[PDB]
Amino acid sequence: WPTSKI
Amino acid sequence: GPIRKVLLLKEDHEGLGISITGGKEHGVPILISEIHPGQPADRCGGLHVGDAILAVNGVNLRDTKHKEAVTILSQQRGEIEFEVVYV
Known part of the structure; x- marks a missing residue:
C-alpha cells in the first residue's frame, strides 16, 4: 500500500 | 478496540504529523x-x-x-475531531 505523510 | 473520539489542535503552519497508509x-x-x-x-x-x-x-x-483521504484530511484546520479505532 502507499503511504503519505500529512 | 472501542471506537474513540479524539481532538487534535493544530496551527496553520503545520501538518497533522501522521503518516497514513491503506485506503478502499x-x-x-x-x-x-x-x-x-x-x-x-x-x-x-x-x-x-x-x-x-x-x-x-x-x-x-x-x-x-x-x-x-489525503485531500480530506489535509483540508482540515484548527480544532479537528477524529473518530478512530484500534484493531
Whole structure:
C-alpha cells in the first residue's frame, strides 16, 4: 500500500 | 478496540504529523502508520500507530481511497475531531 505523510 | 473520539489542535503552519497508509482501493481502512514526534497528532495524545481513521470532522473516511483521504484530511484546520479505532 502507499503511504503519505500529512 | 472501542471506537474513540479524539481532538487534535493544530496551527496553520503545520501538518497533522501522521503518516497514513491503506485506503478502499486496497480493501483496508485509512490506517495511521506513523505518529511524528512533537507534531500535532503526537501532542494531542490520543492518536496512535495502528489506529484506523473512521472519520474526521464528521466526514466519513471508512470507504475512501488513499488520495481522497489525503485531500480530506489535509483540508482540515484548527480544532479537528477524529473518530478512530484500534484493531
